[PDB]
């Protein structure tokens, strides 16, 4: 009966969960963790990553 309101709540929660999940994406870099990038590379290539 109350599918419309629950649907709106689901879309908002799902969008937030996807946005949080996207931090786990390398995006074509060696790692998804910034601290690792500093701890492992020189600034000329770390800047690129």
């Amino acid at each position: 009966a109350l599918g419309k309101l629950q649907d709106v709540v689901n879309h908002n929660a799902q969008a937030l969960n996807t946005l949080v999940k996207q931090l786990s994406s390398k995006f074509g870099a060696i790692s998804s963790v910034l601290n690792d990038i500093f701890s492992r590379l020189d600034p000329p290539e770390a800047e690129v990553q």
């Binding site: 963790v33 601290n35 690792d36 500093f38 701890s39």
Partner: peptide
């Protein structure tokens, strides 16, 4: 290795993980 502190905001380095 340094000592561990509880309930305070610190910048830690555990085995290369910052």
């Amino acid at each position: 290795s340094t000592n561990l502190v509880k309930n305070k905001c610190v910048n830690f380095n555990f085995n290369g993980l910052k």
